[PDB]
Design a protein around this ligand. Structure first.
Ligand SMILES: CCCCCC[C@@H]1NC[C@@H](O)[C@H](O)[C@H]1C(=O)O
Ligand SMILES: CCCCCC[C@@H]1NC[C@@H](O)[C@H](O)[C@H]1C(=O)O
Lengths: 620, 620
C-alpha cells in the first residue's frame, strides 16, 4: 500500500536514473517488443523527466497517437546491491507503461500521475543493465482522464450536417480526443530512480495523524498539548521500532519504543507538550524518525509532518479551530519546454509567486502533482486541495467497471502517497463530472460517487473533508454536490454565459447563491475567470482585455463578500497553459492571472492588493 | 429614383456640412421632440462623417441602445439660394433617421448604408439654420442587417439550462442582438451636404451602358467600335440635352444632341471608334457630360464611366471577352476611431495595399460602401462585387412583408446609386442566408430570393451577373445557390470544422468540389480563412498562429488550382475588424491577412507572392 519517497541514509541509498535517454516513436496500438532486448535503433534523445511532446520540433509529437519507447543503460557497483532489496521507481509515466529490464517484462501500470515500482532484485546483474520503457498516451471512454472514443475535443467545433465533413472525418488521422481542457502531455513526466532497503526487514509505510489538540493558543501558534498517532508498516521476513519526534531544530522532544506485531505493524500515540502548530502562512514541521531495531539500527526512515487539525463545522472550515478562508487558484503542471514534466525551479518560483500574490492555497487541478511540490508547500505554509485525474467523466463512464476501478486506484493511490502532508486539508474526487439532468441520471451519478466519497474518508487516517468540483450546471437537479463536505463550484457567469454583461452575471450569481444559502453547507469557488491576452487594453474593457479580467473579479468578489457561508475564492487559472487547439483557445488557455511565463496581468496586481487585506483566519 | 452624387459646376454648387456637430444620447425608443426646436442642451462634440460609438471614452457608446441626436447650425448667402432648388443630402445615416430643419420635420429614412435627400427650398431661411438629425441604431427581426429579437449574438455562448441564467437574462439591460459578425457601428457614418440645382428643369439621373463591343484588340486595350447607350432623366416643370463624351485627356471624341420626351427622359446610343477599354489592372475612364439646353446652359452634370462588357459564359467570367480570375477578399468599412465612418485616406491606402498584394478585386461585405471608394476603384482598376445589407436572414424574415420591401429597397437603391461604375462586375443580394434543410425550407428560401435575383437583373441597365453569397451548409438540399449566375461560397473547412486538420479539411473540400464540378456554374470563394494573432508563432503552426494561417491558404489554394471551373479566390478578411464581444472574438474578428492597422501577417506575404504569379486574364 505504501509509497514513501525514496530516501538516502545509513541503511538506504537512492540511484537517480534521470538524464538524456534514448527514444523512438512507435505504433498506434503496438511497439516492437524486441526493442527491450537490444539498444534502440537510430534513437532520438529525450530528457527525463519531461513530456516528450515539445522536445522535438522536427517531429509533430503533439499529434502523436499511441506508443513511444524510452531506453537507457545503467550500472552500479555490485557491493552496494549486495544483500539489498532493490526497487525501481517511476514517479510518473503518462498514461500507461510496460517496463522491461534486461529484456524481462517487469510489469505494467495504468495511471499517469501516480508513482509505481518494481522489485528488480533478481532482474539486475553486474555491468550495464538495459532499461526499456514503453509509454502509451492513448485516452478514451475507459481512461482517467477521460477521452472521447469519437467526435470532437472539449468544446470542439463541427459542421456535422455537411456530408463532406462527415465523410472526411471517417478517414482523418487518428488522434486522442480529450474530454478535458489541457493538452495531453505524455511520457516520463516525473523522476525515475532505483533505491535500496534492507531485505530481511524494512519500513514499508508510515502514517502520522494529529488526533487531538488541547488548549490551543489564541493565535494558534501553539497548543498546550498535542496528541499525535503513528502507524508504521513493515515488509520482509518481539521486534521493536523506535520513534523519535524531532522539532524544527532537530531536538528530540518526544520518543517511544513500540512493539511490532504481525502485515507487520506498529501503532500508538505520542503526547507533545507546547506543540508548535502548522498554519497557513506560518508553517512548522516536525520529523517523525522511525528506526527498526535489531545499539545498532536495522532500517530507518525520516518522515516530515505537521501538527494541525481540519474540521468542517456548519458553514465554517476550521484549521486548528479557527475559521479559514481560501485565497488562491487552480493550477497546472505546465511550462513551455517541459510540458507536464516536473521542474523544481518552476515549483520554487511558483511558490514565491503565491506569496507575492498573498494567496494561501491552490488545487491540484486536475491530477496529483509531483511529490516535491507538496514538500515545498509543507514548509512554505500553503494549503492544498488534492485532486485525482477524474476529469471529463459522464454517464458513459459510471457504467464502466474498468473506469470505476481505475477511479478507486487513483483515490487510494493519491491518499496513500500524500496522507502525511499537513498542507493538504481536503480531497477532490472529480472535476466537473456529469451530475444533473432528468430521469435516473442524477441518481446514477450519486450512486457512482457516494462510495468514492466514502472511500476517500476511509482511506485518510486524518479524515479530512472530501469534495467534488462541480461544473456550471442545473444545480436544482444535481443531487450529488450538495452532499459533499464542502461545496466546490466552478462558475463562469459573464464569460461562457451572459457574455460581457457583468450586471447580469452578478444577478445570476446571486440567484444561485440564494440557492446555496439554504443548503447550509460551506461553499467556495474552485474556478472562475476570463480568457485574457496580455497587452490587450480598453478604457471600457471588453472580453480578452486585461481590464475586463480585472473588472470581472472585482464585480464577482464583491458579491461573494456578502455571503458569510462563502469560505473561499480559488480562481481559474494561476497561469496560462497549453491545450488542444481550437477556436476558443488562443495559444492555449488564457484564463491565467499570470502569463505562461509567470508575468502578472492587470488582474494579478488587483488580486494581490485585495488578498493582502484578507486574513487567513477570521475574514468571515 | 436617381441619386447622383452632388456636383459643383457653373449651374450647381455643393455646400458640405461635415465637421464637429453637437450631440446627445437619447432613449431606448424615443427622443425629446423639443431638441429639434432649439439648440441641444449640454451637448457633446461629435465629428461627422463617423460612427459615434468610439468618439467618447467617458461613455460606453458601444453599449448604447436606441436613439441619439445630432445637431448643427449653418448659414449660406441668400444670393446662392436665390431661385435655386435646395437639396439636403445624407450619404448615410445608420440605421434610421428623422431629420428636422428649423423645427420643421423634413422626413425619415431607414436604410443605414444608402443615401437619401430632402428638398429644403422652403424650410431654409436667411441667417443661421438649425439642423437636427435623430439617428436610431436598433436592429431586430425586421431590419437589414438582421437583428435578434431575443437571445444571443453571432457564434454566441450560452448555458440556457441554468435557472439563474434564464432569470438574469429577462432583467438584463436591453442591447442590440445582431445576426451578423461585425459591430453595429451607428450614426452619421458618411457625408452630409447641401446642394443646389436649377429649379425649373434639372438633370435627375444618368445611366451609361456598354451595349456592344466590335472587334476587341488582342490585348483588349481597345475595340474597333464601342456602342454605348445613355439614359438621362429630368425633373421640374421641344427641349434638348447635349451629351459630350470626353476621353481621359478631356478631348471631346463624340457628341450628340437628344430630344427630351415626357418622367421627362432622353435616351439614345453613341458609337465610339477605337474606344479605349476599362480592364482590371488597366483602368480607362471617359466622362459623359450632359447639358440641358434652353449658347447658354441650363443645367449640367459630368458622369464618369468606363467601357467594358461583362458576361458569364459556361464556367467562365468574361470581361471584354477574356476569362477573368478573381484575386481578393471581403472587406469591411472598419477602422480604429472612425468605426464604419468613411475615411478616404484609408480608402486610398487600402487601394494601394490591394496593388501591393497583387489582388485585383473585393466584395463590399456586407453593405454598400461609401461612394468615393467606387470612384477610387474605377480609376485604379480594381474589380468590385457590390452587396446589399441582407445579412443574418432566415425563414423568419422570408415570411415578413416589411423585410421583403426593405430588401427590394436596398437592391434598387444600391443599383440606382452604383450602376455607372465600370469597376462593379457583379451584384450580391445576400450574405449567408438560410437556404437548406428539409421539408419546405429550401423551397421557401428559393421563392423569396428568385424574384430578388430577377429584380437585380431588371434594375441594372448593364445586366451584370447576380449572385448570393452562400454559407457553409448542406449543399445537397440547398436549391437556391446553384441557380445564381455565379456560385459564391463561404467555406471554413479546417477552422470551424475539422479544426486544425488540413489533410481532412482538403479531403472534405474536394468532396464538395466534386459536387460543384457537375453543377456547371462558375464557382468562386467569397470567404475562407482562420483567426490569426500577429506575433503568435510555431514551428508546427496551430490555430491562431501566423504559420497556420499561411499553411491554411497554401493547402486550400493548391486544391482549387486543380479545378478549371473555379474562377476566383476571395478570402476572409482583408483586415482585422471590430465585432460584438464574445469568446471566439479576440478583440474582434482576427481573420484579416492584415492587422486592423493594415500591417501584413505572414500569410499576406505568401499570398502576395502567389498572386504576383497569377494573371487577371487567362489563368484558367
Ligand atoms: C460554464 C460551463 C463551462 C465551464 C468550463 C470551464 C473549464 N473547467 C475545467 C477547466 O479544466 C477548464 O480549463 C475550464 C475552461 O474552459 O477554462
Ligand atoms: C462554418 C459555417 C459558419 C461560417 C461563418 C463565417 C462568417 N461569415 C460571415 C462573416 O461576416 C463572418 O465574419 C465570418 C466569420 O465568422 O469569420
Amino acid at each position: 500500500n505504501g509509497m514513501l519517497y525514496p530516501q538516502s541514509n545509513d541503511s538506504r541509498i537512492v540511484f537517480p536514473l534521470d538524464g538524456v535517454w534514448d527514444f523512438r516513436t512507435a505504433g498506434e496500438d503496438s511497439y516492437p517488443a524486441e526493442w527491450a532486448d537490444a539498444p534502440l535503433p537510430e534513437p532520438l534523445p529525450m530528457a527525463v523527466p519531461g513530456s516528450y511532446n515539445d522536445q522535438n520540433d522536427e517531429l509533430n509529437l503533439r499529434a502523436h497517437y499511441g506508443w513511444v519507447v524510452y531506453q537507457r543503460s545503467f550500472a552500479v557497483p555490485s557491493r552496494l546491491v549486495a544483500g539489498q532489496r532493490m526497487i525501481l521507481r517511476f514517479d510518473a509515466a503518462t498514461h500507461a507503461a510496460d517496463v522491461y529490464l534486461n529484456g524481462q517484462l517487469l510489469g505494467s501500470h495504468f495511471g499517469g500521475f501516480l508513482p509505481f515500482e518494481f522489485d528488480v532484485t533478481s532482474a539486475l546483474h553486474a555491468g550495464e543493465n538495459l532499461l526499456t520503457v514503453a509509454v502509451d498516451n492513448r485516452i478514451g471512454s475507459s481512461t482517467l482522464p477521460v477521452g472521447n472514443d469519437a467526435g470532437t475535443a472539449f468544446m470542439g467545433s463541427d459542421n456535422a450536417n455537411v456530408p463532406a465533413v462527415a465523410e472526411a472525418k471517417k478517414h482523418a488521422r487518428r488522434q486522442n480526443l480529450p474530454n478535458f481542457d489541457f493538452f495531453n502531455f505524455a511520457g516520463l513526466n516525473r523522476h525515475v530512480e532505483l533505491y535500496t532497503t534492507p531485505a530481511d526487514a524494512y519500513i514499508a509505510d508510515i502514517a502520522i495523524t494529529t488526533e487531538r489538540l488541547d488548549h490551543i493558543a489564541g493565535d494558534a501558534c501553539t497548543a498546550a498539548n498535542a496528541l499525535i498517532a503513528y502507524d508504521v508498516t513493515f515488509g520482509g521476513d518481539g521486534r521493536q521500532v523506535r520513534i523519535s519526534i524531532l522539532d524544527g531544530e532537530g531536538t528530540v522532544v518526544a520518543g517511544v519504543t513500540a512493539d511490532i506485531e504481525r502485515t507487520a505493524k506498529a501503532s500508538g500515540e505520542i503526547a507533545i507538550r507546547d506543540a508548535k502548530l502548522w498554519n497557513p502562512g506560518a508553517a512548522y514541521l516536525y520529523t517523525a524518525v522511525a528506526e527498526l531495531l535489531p545499539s545498532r539500527i536495522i532500517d530507518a526512515y525520516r518522515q516530515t509532518f505537521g501538527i494541525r487539525t481540519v474540521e468542517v463545522s456548519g458553514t465554517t472550515f476550521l484549521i486548528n479551530g479557527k475559521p479559514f478562508y481560501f485565497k488562491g487558484f487552480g493550477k497546472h503542471e505546465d511550462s513551455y519546454f517541459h510540458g507536464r514534466g516536473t521542474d523544481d525551479v518552476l515549483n520554487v518560483k511558483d511558490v514565491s509567486l503565491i506569496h507575492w500574490l498573498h494567496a494561501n492555497s491552490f488545487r491540484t487541478s486536475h491530477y496529483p502533482y509531483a511529490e516535491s511540490m507538496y514538500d515545498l508547500c509543507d514548509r512554505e505554509g500553503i494549503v492544498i486541495i488534492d485532486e485525482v485525474p477524474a476529469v471529463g467523466m459522464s454517464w458513459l463512464q459510471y457504467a464502466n467497471p474498468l473506469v470505476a476501478e481505475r477511479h478507486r486506484e487513483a483515490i487510494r493511490g493519491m491518499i496513500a502517497r500524500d496522507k502525511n502532508h499537513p498542507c493538504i486539508v481536503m480531497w477532490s474526487i472529480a472535476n466537473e463530472p456529469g451530475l444533473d439532468g432528468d430521469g435516473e441520471r442524477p441518481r446514477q451519478a450519486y450512486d457512482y460517487f457516494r462510495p468514492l466519497y466514502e472511500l476517500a474518508h476511509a482511506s485518510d487516517p486524518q479524515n479530512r473533508p472530501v469534495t467534488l468540483v462541480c461544473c456550471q450546471n442545473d444545480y436544482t437537479t444535481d443531487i450529488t454536490e450538495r452532499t459533499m463536505d464542502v461545496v466546490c463550484i466552478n462558475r463562469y457567469y459573464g464569460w461562457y454565459n451572459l457574455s460581457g454583461d457583468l450586471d447580469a452575471a452578478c444577478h445570476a450569481l446571486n440567484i444561485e447563491l440564494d440557492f446555496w444559502e439554504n443548503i447550509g453547507k460551506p461553499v467556495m469557488f474552485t474556478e472562475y475567470g476570463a480568457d485574457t491576452i496580455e497587452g490587450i487594453h480598453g478604457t471600457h474593457g471588453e472580453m480578452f482585455s486585461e481590464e475586463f479580467q480585472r473588472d470581472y473579479y472585482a464585480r464577482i468578489n464583491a458579491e461573494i463578500d456578502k455571503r458569510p457561508w462563502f469560505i473561499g475564492e480559488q480562481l481559474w487559472n494561476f497561469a496560462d497553459f497549453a491545450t488542444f487547439q481550437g477556436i476558443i483557445r488562443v495559444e492555449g488557455n488564457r484564463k491565467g492571472i499570470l502569463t505562461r511565463d509567470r508575468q502578472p496581468k492587470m488582474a494579478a496586481h488587483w488580486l494581490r492588493e485585495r488578498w493582502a487585506g484578507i486574513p487567513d483566519y477570521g475574514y468571515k
